[PDB]
Design a protein around this nucleic acid. Structure first.
Ligand SMILES: Cc1cn([C@H]2C[C@H](O)[C@@H](COP(=O)(O)NP(=O)(O)OP(=O)(O)O)O2)c(=O)[nH]c1=O
Ligand SMILES: [Mg+2]
Ligand SMILES: [Mg+2]
Ligand code: NA
Ligand code: NA
Length: 326
DNA sequence: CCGACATCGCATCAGC
DNA sequence: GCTGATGCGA
DNA sequence: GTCGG
């Protein structure tokens, strides 16, 4: 990355607007801008040069001019010195503590890691686990470990029912040399868009993974989505592996391609592709791609037989997962 | 200019 | 208990 | 914050 300084600045601004200002559209704006700059194959010389890129307007162009000249942004320098901002920005790093909860905690005088550890009774279950593994969850996962994790998940799933198919998606499927967590897409022939012929399909998989002590904690768990914690087994006298975030998503078998497109991401890629879909008169979610009728309201799900079919509908050239890391 | 901006599962809560 | 909104993270 | 209609 030739423009690391700029993209870091924009990411920190994005995080500010999300956590502190609670302005999700400003968060999205900064992150779109950071993304379009990150893939720009020249070392940016000026704000004007950057402004040519879609997503970079006048305000960000001016910030880039300040940053290139001085190596800093006064706006960020001030944000970093603001106590409420600093407090909120820290608290939100705990999984389960969002922008609203963070402000509420600060109001109640709970604003440090130590404050959290003595007020565990004021956290909900998710927050409690996020606190427990606060350190572990900010560690990246080497692809080598992702492979061991994949190996365990796929084989344990096979043991429950050989007709399950588990696909690791997210940054892993995009070929990343490290990941922030593990994302698993799960299908079973019994569960389609037409019916659910067996209950507990996701539950039985989670149970098996708990049984072999791979899954260690549960943040949330419903009929189709599990969000939790896992850990690789270590050997005698070895320091234990860090605990890792794992998500498992059960998607109707006949909707696998929309499902795998969604869970492969990246999140910015999905946002941009779905935005483009809307411009082309379609709407895309993890289940279907549907036309938007004369109404403005989604019609019937269109035939999809590959990821590429989805690209074709919105008139995009196909892009392999490795080229979706926006 | 000017607000529309992708989309959704689960946990939680207010209101009835 | 049901419904719908909100917070949160994906 | 940005940008298309
Ligand atoms: C956060 C997020 C994720 N997703 C989809 C695309 C992501 O690739 C996929 C998994 O979410 P993630 O684990 O938060 N992101 P990742 O797997 O691409 O990257 P990382 O290595 O986990 O950080 O879910 C969205 O569609 N909208 C989102 O806002
Ligand atoms: Mg991931
Ligand atoms: Mg994930
Ligand atoms: Na621009
Ligand atoms: Na958080």
């Amino acid at each position: 990355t030739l423009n690391g300084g700029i993209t870091d600045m924009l990411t920190e601004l994005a995080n500010f607007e999300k956590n502190v200002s609670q302005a999700i559209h400003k968060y999205n704006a900064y992150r779109k801008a950071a993304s379009v700059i990150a893939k720009y194959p020249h070392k940016i010389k000026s704000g004007a040069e950057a402004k040519k890129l879609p997503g970079v307007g006048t305000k960000i162009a001016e910030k880039i001019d300040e940053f290139l000249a001085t190596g800093k942004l006064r706006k960020l320098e001030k944000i970093r010195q603001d106590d409420t901002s600093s407090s909120i920005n820290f608290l939100t790093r705990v999984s389960g503590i969002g922008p609203s909860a963070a402000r509420k905690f600060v109001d109640e005088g709970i604003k440090t890691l130590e404050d959290l550890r003595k007020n565990e009774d004021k956290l909900n279950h998710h927050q409690r686990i996020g606190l427990k593994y606060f350190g572990d969850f900010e560690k990246r996962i080497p692809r080598e470990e992702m492979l061991q994790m994949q190996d365990i998940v796929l084989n344990e799933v096979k043991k429950v029912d050989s007709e399950y198919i588990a696909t690791v998606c997210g940054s892993f499927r995009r070929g990343a040399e490290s990941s922030g967590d593990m994302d698993v897409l799960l299908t079973h022939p019994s569960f389609t868009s037409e019916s659910t012929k067996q209950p507990k399909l996701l539950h039985q998989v989670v149970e098996q993974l708990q049984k072999v002590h791979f899954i260690t904690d549960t943040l949330s768990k419903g009929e189709t989505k599990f969000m939790g914690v896992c850990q690789l087994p270590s050997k005698n006298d070895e320091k234990e592996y860090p605990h890792r975030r794992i998500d498992i998503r059960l998607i109707p078998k006949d909707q696998y391609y929309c499902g795998v497109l969604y869970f492969t991401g990246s999140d910015i890629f999905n946002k941009n592709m779905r935005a483009h879909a809307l411009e082309k008169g379609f709407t895309i979610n993890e289940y279907t791609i549907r036309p938007l009728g004369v109404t403005g309201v989604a019609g019937e799900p269109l035939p999809v037989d590959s990821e590429k079919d989805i690209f074709d509908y919105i008139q995009w050239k196909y892009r392999e997962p490795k080229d979706r890391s926006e």
